[PDB]
Amino acid sequence: MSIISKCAIAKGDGTFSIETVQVESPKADEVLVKVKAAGLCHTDHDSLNWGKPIVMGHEGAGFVEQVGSAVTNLNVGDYVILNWATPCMTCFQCQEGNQHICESNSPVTAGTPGHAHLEGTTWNDTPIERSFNIGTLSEYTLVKASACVKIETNMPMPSASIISCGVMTGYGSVVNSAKLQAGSSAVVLGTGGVGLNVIQGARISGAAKIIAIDINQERLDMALQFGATHTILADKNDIGLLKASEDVKKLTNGRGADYAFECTAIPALGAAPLAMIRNAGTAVQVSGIEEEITIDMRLFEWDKIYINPLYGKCRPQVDFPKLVSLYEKGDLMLDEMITRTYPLENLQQAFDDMLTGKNAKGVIIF
Amino acid sequence: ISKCAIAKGDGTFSIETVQVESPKADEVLVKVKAAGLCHTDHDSLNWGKPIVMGHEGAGFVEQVGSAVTNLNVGDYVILNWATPCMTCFQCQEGNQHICESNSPVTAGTPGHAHLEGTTWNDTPIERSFNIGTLSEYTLVKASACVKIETNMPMPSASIISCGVMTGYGSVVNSAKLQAGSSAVVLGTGGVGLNVIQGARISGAAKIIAIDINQERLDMALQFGATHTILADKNDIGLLKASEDVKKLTNGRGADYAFECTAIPALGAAPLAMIRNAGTAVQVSGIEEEITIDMRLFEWDKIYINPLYGKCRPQVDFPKLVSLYEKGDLMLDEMITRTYPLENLQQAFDDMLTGKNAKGVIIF
Amino acid sequence: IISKCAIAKGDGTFSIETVQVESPKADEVLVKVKAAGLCHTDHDSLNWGKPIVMGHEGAGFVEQVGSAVTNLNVGDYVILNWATPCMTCFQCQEGNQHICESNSPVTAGTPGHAHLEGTTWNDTPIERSFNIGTLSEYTLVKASACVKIETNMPMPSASIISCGVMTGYGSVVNSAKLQAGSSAVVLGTGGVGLNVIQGARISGAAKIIAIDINQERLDMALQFGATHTILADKNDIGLLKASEDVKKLTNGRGADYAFECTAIPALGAAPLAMIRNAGTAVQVSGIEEEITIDMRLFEWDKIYINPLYGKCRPQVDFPKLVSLYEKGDLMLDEMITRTYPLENLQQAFDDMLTGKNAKGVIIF
Amino acid sequence: MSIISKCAIAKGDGTFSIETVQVESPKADEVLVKVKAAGLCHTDHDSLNWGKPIVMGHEGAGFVEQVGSAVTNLNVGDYVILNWATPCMTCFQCQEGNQHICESNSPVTAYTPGHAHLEGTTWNDTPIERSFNIGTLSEYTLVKASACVKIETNMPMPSASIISCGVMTGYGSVVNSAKLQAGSSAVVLGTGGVGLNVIQGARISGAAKIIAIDINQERLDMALQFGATHTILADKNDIGLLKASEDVKKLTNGRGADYAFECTAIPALGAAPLAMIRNAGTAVQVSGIEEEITIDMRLFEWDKIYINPLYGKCRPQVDFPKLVSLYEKGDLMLDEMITRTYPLENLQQAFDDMLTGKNAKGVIIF
Ligand SMILES: NC(=O)c1ccc[n+]([C@@H]2O[C@H](COP(=O)([O-])OP(=O)(O)OC[C@H]3O[C@@H](n4cnc5c(N)ncnc54)[C@H](O)[C@@H]3O)[C@@H](O)[C@H]2O)c1
Ligand SMILES: NC(=O)c1ccc[n+]([C@@H]2O[C@H](COP(=O)([O-])OP(=O)(O)OC[C@H]3O[C@@H](n4cnc5c(N)ncnc54)[C@H](O)[C@@H]3O)[C@@H](O)[C@H]2O)c1
Ligand SMILES: NC(=O)c1ccc[n+]([C@@H]2O[C@H](COP(=O)([O-])OP(=O)(O)OC[C@H]3O[C@@H](n4cnc5c(N)ncnc54)[C@H](O)[C@@H]3O)[C@@H](O)[C@H]2O)c1
Ligand SMILES: NC(=O)c1ccc[n+]([C@@H]2O[C@H](COP(=O)([O-])OP(=O)(O)OC[C@H]3O[C@@H](n4cnc5c(N)ncnc54)[C@H](O)[C@@H]3O)[C@@H](O)[C@H]2O)c1
Ligand SMILES: [Zn+2]
Ligand SMILES: [Zn+2]
Ligand SMILES: [Zn+2]
Ligand SMILES: [Zn+2]
Ligand SMILES: [Zn+2]
Ligand SMILES: [Zn+2]
Ligand SMILES: [Zn+2]
Ligand SMILES: [Zn+2]
Question: How far apart are CA D101 and CA A302, in angstroms?
C-alpha cells in the first residue's frame, strides 16, 4: 500500500512548491498520521534556506490512519499530537530526562532512528526527508511512534497542532528550563509564535510582572491578550535593546527583572536578555543562534544564569498532556492563538503573515 | 493608652486597657487598624501566661524610632511576626522565619520591643508573637514592620501577616510547586484557601480541596479549587478520601498535598493523598504525640513541616501585594466579615464553625 | 542449562537445589553468576510465602544474549540491579527508575521478570527474588537487570553495589543531594550505613558522626570515612541522649543532615532528633509498621524522606560508582567480611544473624 | 592615634611602589587589623592599570589590634580572615543570600559603605582607597567589622590568607555556584590561584573525573598534587582551546564533561567551558571579562548553563568556617598552596612568580 499526499516541499534554493509525495505503509515501529492541521513556526521559513529537499512542517495534529505491529498503546482513529523529540528513551540524555536532546533520535542533536524508514516517503521515486522527522505540512505523514502523543479530547485540531513547537518551547522554557518562581518578574523579548507562549508560561507560573517587548505594535497587543502586564515598544535600530533595558530597569526598581526570555530571531540580540536581568537573574535564549556574534562580556557579569534551551525541555508523553489540561482548565489559551487558517496552496500568504506581524500563529489546515 | 484583648492563662480573654510607651531607637509605634484572626490565637488562650493577643495586623506608623531609617510617620505597614535579626545561622541561610535569636517560635527575646513598652496594671506584659496585633496601638521592633506604597484595604493587608503568608509560601517557597501539577489541600480554611491560591498562582492543573465543612469547600472553589471532597469526621487518617484522590489522579496520587486541618491525628494524611516521589507538606504544626503507619512515607515522598511559609517578610510581602494588585491574589473576598474588638468571641465562633473564610477586627 | 540454586520455601527454610534455566528471549539475558552478596532481606525471603530462587545482589559474566539485546555481548561484565526499569512509565519518565510502576519488585509487586518457564524447578516455574534471584550459578533476567561495566575489578565487590552501596551512597548523593562542607550523622553503620558514610566522604561532608551499638561497627565506620563516633545504648529511646551528644558536636542546633539505617522501626524518627531546623532527615531503612512519633521532632523545616534504593538509575549510577572505586575514593573490597560457598549458605545467615559479618558474598 | 603603615600602592599608570600610609584609629563600625600574611591574586596585577592610586591587596589575614565601640563580636587579638564582600545584610541581594553581590557595600557590584572612612588611610596627606575595600598589602589595614571573619584555630596565617579570594572563589564556583554533584566529570581551564581550588572543590565534591588543562607544565603538575585526575597540555595558539576540547571529549565518551570551569585570565577563552561541556552541562567562567569578545553561539547551544559567578557566592561568615573545618579534616590543602613567602619589598618577584607559573600561591609576610 502506497498513498499519495499533497505537501509543501522545500528544495534547497530558498524556495518551496506544493507537490505530491508517496507515503508507504507503516513499519512495525511507525505510524501513518492523517494530518488535520499543521502550524507554522519561524524555523519553517529558515528551512527553505537549508540546502536539502525536505517535507516542511514540524507542528502537526491529526488521526492515526494506520499503526505498525510493535506499537501497542494507540489505535486507528486515535487523536494524536505530533512531536519532534522522537525520544529513544534509553540513551544518556533520555535517562537524565532530557529526551529533547536525545543523542540518537533527535533531528537536531543527531543531525536517524527517530525518522521513519526513508522509502516510506518519496518524491518522484527518490526518498526525501520529513523536516524534524515529522514533516507536518503534508496530507499524510509516516513518522515513528515516538513522534505521536495520544490525547483524548475534542480540542480543536488547530489548537492541538500548535503545541508541537511554539506552545511547548515557550511554556517549557519558562516552566521546565528557567523554572520560573511565582511572584517573580519576567521580561519577554519577541512576543511572536514562541514569545507569546513564554508569556502564558510566565502568567500561568505566577509571575507578577510580565514585560512584553517587540518592534511591532500588534504583536504587543497580542502580548497583552495572552497575559502581559507591561508593554514596551522597541525600535529595531536600538542595538542590543540596551535602550529597552533602561526602560525595564525603571519597571524593576533600578536592578532588573528576575527572568528574561529571548525569542526575537535576531542573532545580534543573543546577549540582550542579559541586559534586562538583575544580577543572579536567569536569562533564557529560546531562539537558537548559529552565527558568530560579538558580546560585551560585562553583560554576563554577576551570577546570571544563561541557557539556550531546546524545545522547552520537552518530554512529549509527559509535557503535552499537562499543556492539554491547562487548556481545558482555561489557563492556556490556544484557540485565540489561531488567528487565521490557510489552505496548503496558500502557505506563501501564511509565511507572509507570520513575518509581517499580523498573526499570533498561522495554521495550515487539511 | 490603648484598648487591647488580654489572654489569661486560666484560658479566657478580656478586653482591657494597656499603656504604650514611646518608641525606642529601633522600634516603631503602630496604630493598628485591622487585626486578622488565626487558629493559633485560639490556642494562645490555652498557653500559660498573660499576653496581648494577636499576630495578624496592619496599620499606620504614628511614631518612629531615632535609628529607624526606612520608615516614617504616616507610612502604611503590614506587621510580621518573624522579626528577623538578619545575622544568625538561619538568617544567613535565608531562613528568616526560624530566626534563632528573634523568632517567637524558635527562640521563645530580642526582636520583641522593650518590656516596659506595654504595661497592664503596672506589670509589663508580652505582645503575642512579639507584635500583639489585637491592640489599638502596638509598639514593636522595626523588623516586624513591612511598608507598602500602594493603598489597599486595611483588612486585606492584615491577613497577609499570617494565614496568607503561611499558605501561599508553603506552596511557593517550601514545596516550590511546579506548574501543571496536581494539588490536594487538607482543610481549606484561612491557611487552606491561600494554599489553594498559592496552587493556582503557581499554575497547578488540578487542585483537590478536602474539607469536613461544605461552606469552606464552597470557599475553596471561590479561591481556585478544581475538585471538592467532603470528608467525614470518622474517616480515620482520611483513608477513604485518599482513595477518591487517587481515583482523580489516574492511580498514583497527587504530586503535592498540604495538611492544615488543625487535627493532630491527620499529620501523616498528606502522604496518603500523594504519589511516590511527591512532596507532602504538613502545615498545621503538631506538638502532640501521634501514631503513624510508616507505609505512608514510603517511596521517595518528601515530608516537611514548615513555619510561616518560609517567610522573609521584606521580600515575600511586597510580592504578595503585587499579585493582589495584578488580581491573582484574592484577599478582599476573604474578609467575609468585620468585627470590633469587643465582638471578638463571635469572630472565633464564625471562624471555628465554618462561617468565615477569614475574620478581621477593625479599629 | 542446569543451575544449582538456593530455593527458599514459604515455611522459613531453604535448601540448595537444581533448576533448569532456559535460553534467553529477545529482551532478556542469561548471566553466569560469579558473586552474590547477601542481606537481611534474603532472610526475610524465607518468611515470605512463596517458593523463590533467592538473591538480590549479583555480578557476573553474560553467557547468552537474546535477539533484541544488542547493547551488550557474550562475555561482557554485568552488575545486576533489582529496579529492572521499564523506562517509559510515569516514574521512569520523571527519572524515578527505582519506583517503576510496571516492573519494580517493590512498587509493582510482572515484566522485569524474565519469562516464567525460563527457570523451572521440577516442572513448576519459580520466581527469582526481586526479579533477579542471584544465588544461582546461572540466572535468566531481563536486560534491564543488567548493567554492563568495563573494568577488571573483583566480582564480589561488584556484587555489593547491587544493594547496600547503591542505597547508602544514593541516599546521600541523589536523595539527600548532600552539600559539601556539611555535618552528617549516620545511625546504623552497617551494610547500608557504611556506604552512607562513604557517600558523605565523597560528597565533601566536613563532619560525619557515626552512631551504632556495636563497637566493631563504629571502628569500621572510622575506617570507611567517619570523623566522629558516639557509642549508643539500646535502652536509649529515639536515641535522644545520642541526639544531645550530637548537638554538642554541632554547635547546639543539630546536624545539617542525618540518616536512618539501623533496621529498628522504633527508631524511624531519630534522624529528625539529630538535625537542626531546616536540615534534611533520610530514613533509608523502610518501616512497614506503625510507630509513635513525637511530632515536635518534625517541627521546623526538616525534610523527612524514605527513599528506595538511593534513587537508582542503574545504567547511570552504577558506572559512576565503578569510577569512584577506580579513583580510590569508593571502597568496596574492605566491605566484604568473608566469602562463602553456596553450599555453606547457612554459615552466612548464622554469621549475619550473629553480627560477625557486615556483608557476605557467595561466589561461584 | 594615627599609625604609620608600610604598604604597596598602585598608581594609575600601571606602576607599583611600596609607600607608607597614615592609618587612623577605628570608628564605631570599624576594626584595625595587623595583617600578618597577604596572598597575591591575578586581580592585583590588573589592579595596577586601574587609573587611581590604591593600596593593594584583597587576600589577607592577621590579628585584631583595635576594635570599634559598636563592634560586639570581635575583640583585640582575635584571629581574623579578611574578606571583600563586606555585606550589609539587608539589601535585596543579601536577603536572597547573595552577600557577594551586595547592592550597598560590594566593591564590585556597588568608595562604598563597607569601606572604612576615607580619612582612615591617607597617602601624602590625601585620602586613598583600599583595593576591594580591604587593601591587604599593608602592615595595618583599617576595615569595617564586616570585612573580618574570626577563626578559632591555629592555622598558618599564610594558609589562612589565601581563603580571602583564591580558595573561596575557586571552591565556591564548584560548590555554591555550580552545585557540582558527585560522580560527575569536571574540566578546569587554568590551574592557578583560582583553578587549583576549583580542583580541590571538585575533589571535595566527589567528581569522578577532574581534567586539568593549562599551558604551563609546572602548574599542571600542581593540579595533580591538589586533585586532578587527568591533564591536558594546551597550546597558546589553540584558539578557544577547541582541540583541548577534542581531547576532553575523548576522555568523556565523546559527549563532553558534565561541568567545566574557566579561569585562564584570557578573555577570548570566555566561552571555552561551553566547548568542554556535554549538552545540559554547566559551564562556569570565573575569570571575569570586561572587554567584548566574538563567540560562535552554537557553543551555547543546547541546555548549557553558563554563569559568571562573583567570589564563589561567598557568605564570608558561613563559607570561611566551612573551609577551615575542611582544612582540619585534611581535605583542603592550603599549607601546600603557599609555595612561597616574600617580604613586602619583593612584591615584584611575587608578582613575577605568579605570572611565570612558578607558584601555586605566593604570600607576602609582614
Ligand atoms: N529553541 C527551540 O527549540 C525553538 C523552537 C522554536 C523556535 N525557535 C526559534 O525562536 C525564534 C522565534 O520563533 P517565532 O516562531 O516566535 O518567530 P516570529 O517571527 O513569529 O516572532 C518573532 C518576534 O520577534 C520580534 N522582533 C524582531 N526583532 C525584534 C527586536 N529587535 N526587538 C523586539 N522584538 C523583535 C518580532 O517582531 C516578532 O514579534 C526563531 O528564531 C525560532 O527559530 C527555537
Ligand atoms: N505552620 C504555621 O506557621 C502556621 C501558621 C498559621 C496557622 N497554623 C495552623 O494551621 C492550622 C489551620 O490554620 P487555620 O487558621 O486555617 O484554622 P481553621 O479553623 O480556619 O482551619 C481548620 C479547617 O480544618 C478542616 N478540617 C477539620 N477536620 C477536618 C478533617 N477531618 N478533614 C478535613 N478537613 C478538616 C475544617 O474544614 C476547617 O476549615 C492550625 O493548626 C493553625 O495553628 C500554622
Ligand atoms: N530503602 C531501600 O531500598 C533499602 C535497601 C537495602 C536495605 N534497606 C534497609 O536498611 C536497613 C539497614 O540494614 P543493613 O543492611 O545495614 O543491616 P545491618 O544489620 O548491617 O545494619 C543495622 C545497624 O544498625 C545498628 N544498630 C542496631 N541498633 C542500633 C541502635 N539503637 N542505635 C544505633 N545503631 C543501631 C546495628 O548494630 C547495625 O550495625 C534495613 O532495614 C534494610 O532492609 C533498605
Ligand atoms: N570572579 C572572581 O570573583 C575572581 C576571583 C579571583 C580571580 N578572578 C580572576 O580569575 C582569573 C584567574 O585568576 P588566577 O589568580 O588563578 O590567575 P593565574 O595567572 O595565577 O592562573 C591562570 C592560569 O591559567 C593558565 N593559562 C593562561 N592561558 C591559558 C590558556 N590559553 N590555556 C590554558 N591555560 C592558560 C595560565 O598558565 C595560568 O596557569 C583572573 O582573571 C582573575 O582576575 C576572578
Ligand atoms: Zn519551530
Ligand atoms: Zn534518547
Ligand atoms: Zn497564625
Ligand atoms: Zn536571625
Ligand atoms: Zn541487600
Ligand atoms: Zn517504568
Ligand atoms: Zn582575587
Ligand atoms: Zn547588601
Answer: 7
**Structure-determination approach:** X-ray
Question: For residues A1 and A3, what is the distance between their CA atoms, to the nearest angstrom?
Answer: 7
Strands D2-11 and D15-24: antiparallel
Q: Verify whether the Cβ–Cβ distance B319 to A183 is below 8 Å.
A: yes
DSSP D359: -
When the candidates are 3.20.20.150, 3.40.630.190, 3.30.300.30, 3.40.50.720, the CATH number that belongs to C168-305 is 3.40.50.720
Structure resolution, Å: 2.5
Provide the residue count of chain C.
364
Burial string for B218-257 (b: 16+ CB within 10 Å, else e) reads bbbbbbbbbbbbebeeeeebbeebbeebbeebeebbbbbb
With a Cβ cut-off of 6 Å, ligand 2 is lined by B 38-40, 162-163, 166, 186-187, 189-192, 210-213, 216, 231, 233, 238, 260-263, 266, 283-285, 307-308, 351-352
Q: Compute the distance between CA of residue C250 and CA of residue C271 in angstroms, rounded to an integer.
A: 14
Breaks in chain B (C to N over 2.5 Å), named by the residue before each, are 108
Q: For residue A365, list its beta bridge partners.
A: A37
Q: For chain D, give percent helix, strand, coil, nearest 5.
A: 30, 30, 40
**Quick one: DSSP state of residue C361?**
E
Beta bridge partners of A363: A39, A341
| B272 contacts in chain C (CB < 8 Å) | none
- Please tell me which residue of chain A has the smallest CA distance to D305: A307
Instruction: Name the 3-class secondary structure at B16.
Output: strand
Q: How many other CB atoms are there within 10 angstroms of residue C1's CB atom?
A: 15
Write the CA distances from C192 to C189, C196, C303, D159, integer angstroms. Answer: 7, 7, 20, 38
DSSP annotation string for C93-142: HTT-GGG-TTT-TTTT--TTSPPGGGEEETTEE-EEGGGT--SBSEEEEE
Residue with cell 496594671: B121
Taking alpha carbons only, the member of B58, B69, B63, B85 closest to residue B148 is: B58
Q: After which residues is chain A broken (C to N over 2.5 A)?
A: 111
With a CB cutoff of 8 Å and minimum separation 6, the contacts of D6 are D18, D19, D20, D138, D139, D344, D366
- Label residue C2 exposed, middle or buried (CB < 10 Å: 0-12, 13-18, 19+): exposed
Report the residue among B37, B38, B213, B304 best suited for mutation to probe ligand 2: largest number of ligand atoms under 8 A from its CB.
Answer: B38
Domain spanning B2-161+332-362: which CATH class is it, in words? Answer: alpha beta
Please report all neighbours of D, defined by 3+ CB atom pairs within 8 A. A, B, C
For domain A2-164+335-365, give the CATH number: 3.90.180.10
Backbone angles phi, psi at D122, to 5 degrees: -135, 145
Residue type, A174: V
Closest CA to A192 of A366, A80, A357: A357
SS3 category, C247:
helix
SS3 D37: strand
Instruction: List, in sequence order, every residue forming a beta bridge with B100; answer none if it has no partner.
Output: none
CATH of the domain spanning C2-163+311-363, picked from 3.90.180.10, 3.40.50.11890, 1.20.1250.20, 3.30.1330.10: 3.90.180.10
Residues near ligand 1 (Cβ within 6 A) = A 41-43, 46, 165-166, 169, 189-195, 213-216, 219, 234, 236, 241, 263-266, 269, 286-288, 310-311, 354-355, 357
Residue type, A96: E
CB neighbour burial string for C240-260, b if at least 16 within 10 angstroms, e if fewer: eebbebbeeebeebbbbbbbb
How remote is the C-alpha of D73 from its chain's centroid?
25
Q: Which amino acid is at A71?
A: V
